[PDB]
Amino acid sequence: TTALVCDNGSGLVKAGFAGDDAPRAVFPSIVGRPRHQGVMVGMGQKDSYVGDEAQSKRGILTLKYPIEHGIITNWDDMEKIWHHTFYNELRVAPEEHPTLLTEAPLNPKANREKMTQIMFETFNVPAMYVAIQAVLSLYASGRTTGIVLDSGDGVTHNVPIYEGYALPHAIMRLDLAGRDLTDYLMKILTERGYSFVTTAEREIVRDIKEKLCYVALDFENEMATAASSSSLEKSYELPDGQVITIGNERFRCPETLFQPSFIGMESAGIHETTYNSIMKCDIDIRKDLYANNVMSGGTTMYPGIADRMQKEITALAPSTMKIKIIAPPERKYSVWIGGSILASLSTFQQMWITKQEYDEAGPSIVHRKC
Amino acid sequence: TTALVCDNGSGLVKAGFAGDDAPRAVFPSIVGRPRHQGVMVGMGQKDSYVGDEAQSKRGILTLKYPIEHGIITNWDDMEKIWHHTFYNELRVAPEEHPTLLTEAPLNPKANREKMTQIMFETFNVPAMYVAIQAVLSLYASGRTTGIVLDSGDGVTHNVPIYEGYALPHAIMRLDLAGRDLTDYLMKILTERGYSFVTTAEREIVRDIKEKLCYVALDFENEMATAASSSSLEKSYELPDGQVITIGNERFRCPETLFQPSFIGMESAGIHETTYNSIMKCDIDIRKDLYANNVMSGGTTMYPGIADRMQKEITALAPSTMKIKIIAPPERKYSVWIGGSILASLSTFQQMWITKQEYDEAGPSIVHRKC
Amino acid sequence: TTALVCDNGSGLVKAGFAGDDAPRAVFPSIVGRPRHQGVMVGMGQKDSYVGDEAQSKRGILTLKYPIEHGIITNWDDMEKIWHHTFYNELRVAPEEHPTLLTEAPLNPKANREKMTQIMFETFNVPAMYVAIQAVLSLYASGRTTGIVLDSGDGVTHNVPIYEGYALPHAIMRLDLAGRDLTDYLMKILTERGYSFVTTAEREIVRDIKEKLCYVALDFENEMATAASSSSLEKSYELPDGQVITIGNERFRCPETLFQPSFIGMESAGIHETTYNSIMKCDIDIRKDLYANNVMSGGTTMYPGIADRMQKEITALAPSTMKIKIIAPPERKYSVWIGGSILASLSTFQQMWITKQEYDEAGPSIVHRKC
Amino acid sequence: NFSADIKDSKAYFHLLNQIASGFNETDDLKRAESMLQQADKLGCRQFVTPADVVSGNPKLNLAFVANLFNKYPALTKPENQDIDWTLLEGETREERTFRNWMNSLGVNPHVNHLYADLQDALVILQLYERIKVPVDWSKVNKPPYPKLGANMKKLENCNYAVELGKHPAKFSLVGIGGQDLNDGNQTLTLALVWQLMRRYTLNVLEDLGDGQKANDDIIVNWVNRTLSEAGKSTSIQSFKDKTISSSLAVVDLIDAIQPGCINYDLVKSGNLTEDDKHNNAKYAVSMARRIGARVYALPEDLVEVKPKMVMTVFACLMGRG
Ligand SMILES: Nc1ncnc2c1ncn2[C@@H]1O[C@H](COP(=O)(O)OP(=O)(O)O)[C@@H](O)[C@H]1O
Ligand SMILES: Nc1ncnc2c1ncn2[C@@H]1O[C@H](COP(=O)(O)OP(=O)(O)O)[C@@H](O)[C@H]1O
Ligand SMILES: Nc1ncnc2c1ncn2[C@@H]1O[C@H](COP(=O)(O)OP(=O)(O)O)[C@@H](O)[C@H]1O
Ligand SMILES: [Mg+2]
Ligand SMILES: [Mg+2]
Ligand SMILES: [Mg+2]
């Protein structure tokens, strides 16, 4: 009939049908369970909450993300999320649609195998496929050459591609993403006396981040600016009606992408990670990689981030190469858009893992066909 | 001349000269004001009581703590307290003495700055310093590596240090401490019918808590033992001559340290916080931290606390690691003792903040020097 | 008096006195700098850690190797290393001893010149000499004809000699050695979910490689063997008590030696490189070359390496030739050993570069005398 | 009382003769000359002047008893602990040799073994003394040390010591950390000390030289020229001379300087045996030490022929020159 595209991110679930230009369902990748005593008859029967209803009722719930750093850490809750996607958000029978899934590079093999087994034996799909999120991002950009920087809630990774060929030895991955920035912001909020401890408060801080944070073009002078004047101060209203104000943490939180030392990690920033990935490639294709730096994922939506990346990479480059970063407004859904594009191609239709192949080969078939 | 070590603890004030082995003065961090008609001429002229005078006359007073959760909430009362400290308890001229002050980590900055300004302006100290309390705890043990568990009256926090270096990303802070245990004991004492509602009654309950409570090694069979038998019950006498009896509350109160949900907190237990702080550390030092677990603060004076922590952390450790907890008898003054030590050091004398530096940098100087 | 032999490898430092059968000091060629906040007074005075102290306290330091691919990239840290070895490990005054140093072939010449300048001006040694490492390996063997396969931590190179004469035109060098294998092992350890990202973890994985990896005689047969049964699985205990298990990677890592495309490299395998080197020589001496294949370097210590090389080169030979592999147990030190031999020769005493000669010809003299 | 046998210093000469008479000089100045001669045979001279006997100086009378008794406390010679060549076991010979050096130099705490010894600044500070480096004693503290005033105050002293030495620098000691004395890293340990001993010997060479480091030739030349005054033995020929039996000639040179209280009945002709050599090794050292020699070598040199050590005797000899 038609294929289903499901991009299971660490924080957000993107789902829809192939050929559509946008995902039909976008909801948090969480499961909520009660943490207080029920006292009214007939109301406490519901054991768990999954989608936006979990977000709306988070005040009485404890919230768990099944996926951390692009790894499915809880599989029962993962099945709950897949059931919600198929039967409630999209309202389709999975037995009638081939399904395309996504995954991050440098992941453990059991993750891909177990999602294959779940799709074939629980949802009994006719065919399936697992694609690389950065590759899909390049598809959405209408390109066959460039290096892709993908940054979501759990994983940041780089994949260089030239004329449709990947360079796997140059693929680099960093376990630093939006969730970590949220936690860091939580940490630095206490300087002004603001406190956030509960998982629901974590979502509160995440909203604050998505609204008030931006990327500084020069961190050292933004610090001096904030030190001398209040011009960068901005306000936010808490759910209970309290109002908080921040004017220094707005750029301190995202700077961690360039200075992971703020969270105690030894690794280098995203700009240097990308530069090293490029320097690992052939000297002949490096100019084309320099001119095509594709951004993707919700964490790349900070104001000023593309300018800072262009500046830092220029500082690392031999000054003769021109540096160009491509950051489309639809960055948040580039992976899903590329997935719908790929699933719509006729040349791709022979590449589905069919259930017959699964029945004769086991869950390890995904390693050979993907 | 000689330096002064004042540990403004959340509930208790600990102070004395550098070089001595015990704080010369220890008294509650309270302020009392009358709440009844003064029927005798001349006797009612005193508008406020501070130290043990406040506690002895509490039968006619309303008591207040200028510090909660380790944050100074009433600065004027805090000034009264410092005045009492230096002039009545110490009977010294602060202008002649540099002073060492303490703070819990992850505190609002303004707290530190205001105490700074107070000392230099209200008290005109020659120099001063603010140090993190658990660090002093480690000084007291003579070690250079280990994790300190400090639990006062307002805050419970975890600090790992390896070879004189700490890891800020791995520092844990929990706003659950003795005052909370006291309030929960007040709450649960109502099931037997005992009621305590006034500020002085809280002090009485604190005495009871310090006299009859303990940590169970395994809570479940303890609850069973109390349910069947009565050997756990004990009696206490009220100031008017009334007697109350408790068996089960004796351990249900300290259990909240391991089960914060008892008071509705989503946070994990002190053991779990310890272990997670460990896991936030570099894999190569975890063994030594596992071997060096330092307890500090009046709350950790419960009988059985160390054994329960031993059991639990063993239950979490990879079982090859040798778990060791260090619990000296003088835990109640570990921080103040370490402060005396540190102040006694010649190499520390250049670390003082002199008023001259303050005259240039204002109170903000503390963030750089401390 | 007595000359000094210092073998400055990329991975390990090997040093001692002439006339001895083994180096007196062997320690890693690293420098470590603290990576966290010093918090206890007096403890933080030490900015640098060099020898085995850096490895022990690696948990709080950032590790740097001053040599990569055999080129000295950090010259100040190299000075630190030489100071350490002279004064600490051997505890001698360099002004009183001629010194012997080693170098890999096909290197930039300025490397040689700078080390000369250092020895004569920082340490002002009476005399010195620089030698190619494979030559010393042959000296260690007591032979005068053969091709030496040298593989330490950073460089793999082949040198043929007939009757004491090398043939430079056939000299072949491969920038592929143990460190790269380690990085590849890191890469593939993630497939089971094992992640190592920091410089300290790198030492852990290097230890892993040194303890569990091996050379299969048939890659496809062993791959099938691993795919069928778990008989090849093996387990390792991490420093914090965690245990991990591997059974397929134990040989996929060393295979890169015969399959450099594993890491994306285009160069040929060690067997083939050896073979091609032999084919660049005179048809008359190749037979003798076939009978004397000498290996050295820690990367040449894998189980099954000699047999695999025997089989492969036998497969490349005219089949009328006899293939003989020479692999003494002391491979790890053959360079330093041949050096001690060479330096101990009475005839070599006129081959020293004296300071007087240096004072006239500058550092360039080394190109003439070595 | 003082006026009985102390105002004339009468008892001190009998004491000196006990630890080596003297009172028979019959005159205060002749007695004082005898006292100086007795000091030449004992080495206790630190402040002696003729006023102690001629004027009966009570301060001198009361002070010199310490020199008389502490240097000769019932002749409880610590080398008679080293006569057990491995009185402790498991230490390397080099460490033993350095320990011996410190022992010979009179560091006030007694030597036990290199790992326990020098776990404090006081030791290395005494060393710093012998290198004439000035010491801020105000920054120097106490050894027993309570729970208050613990190893941390020790650490204050310890790192102080590492700023020391690096004050005039040059000793290449940068790698040494101020907190490592408690840590006790073996190679760090040996590193910070061997150069010290080397420096001291260099100082000795400069001291006994003509304003520069003394050369080998002038050593044996002066020895032989002195030997020419007592040439019952031929001469000394080389530092690499295997015929270490010539040690007896070193003693004969000693006899040339002072024939006092030596045992030449113990002395044997050139056809010695190894037991005689073992006897000689310690006996010569003892004699030299008691004369006043800061003997740096271990006695084994009499059976091992180490050219690098033998100069130790010739040093004090030249001093008597
Ligand atoms: N406008 C924004 N500014 C900053 N951060 C954002 C913005 N929008 C989303 N984020 C962050 O991006 C993360 C989600 O990005 P996404 O790519 O959907 O993650 P995933 O790949 O896990 O689905 C969240 O952590 C969120 O806080
Ligand atoms: N023996 C004891 N058993 C249980 N709790 C105790 C005991 N002694 C003191 N406490 C608790 O410790 C708290 C005071 O500890 P302290 O370390 O002085 O705190 P702070 O630093 O906040 O003043 C009080 O709240 C009291 O309830
Ligand atoms: N038993 C072993 N098995 C496999 N690899 C080893 C073994 N021992 C050492 N190695 C590797 O070989 C290298 C040894 O260094 P070395 O041969 O001295 O190189 P260099 O000459 O560059 O110092 C190290 O990188 C280590 O990873
Ligand atoms: Mg994503
Ligand atoms: Mg306290
Ligand atoms: Mg080497």
Residue numbers in the entry:
A (entry chain C), B (entry chain D), C (entry chain B): 5 to 374
D (entry chain A): 291 to 310, 326 to 626
What is written in the article reporting this PDB entry?
To test this hypothesis, we utilized the –Ca2+ dataset, where bundling is not suppressed, which we initially analyzed using IHRSR. Aligning the prebound and prebundling states revealed a major conformational change within CH2 and the CH2–3 linker upon actin engagement: the CH2-3 linker’s ∼120° swing results in a rotation and a 48.7 Å translation of CH2. We next examined whether this conformational transition could directly prime ABD1 for engaging a second actin filament by repositioning it as a rigid body with ABS1 available for binding. Instead, the CH1 position predicted by aligning ABD1 from the prebound state with the portion of CH2 resolved in the prebundling state produces a major steric clash with ABD2, a result that is incompatible with a priming model. Along with our observation that H1 of CH2 is not resolved, consistent with partial CH2 unfolding, this finding suggests that the prebundling reconstruction likely represents a frustrated, metastable state where a partially disordered ABD1 can sample a large conformational space to search for a second actin filament.
Here we focus on human T-plastin, a member of the plastin/fimbrin family of tandem calponin-homology domain (CHD) proteins. T-plastin is a 70.8 kDa monomeric protein that functions as a key actin network stabilizer, strengthening and promoting cell protrusions by localizing to lamellipodia and filopodia. While most cross-linkers bridge filaments through the dimerization or tetramerization of subunits featuring a single actin-binding domain (ABD), plastins contain two ABDs (ABD1 and ABD2) within a single polypeptide chain, each composed of two tandem CHDs. They also feature a flexibly tethered N-terminal regulatory domain (RD) consisting of two Ca2+-binding EF-hand motifs, which inhibits bundling activity in the presence of Ca2+ while still licensing binding to single actin filaments by unclear mechanisms.
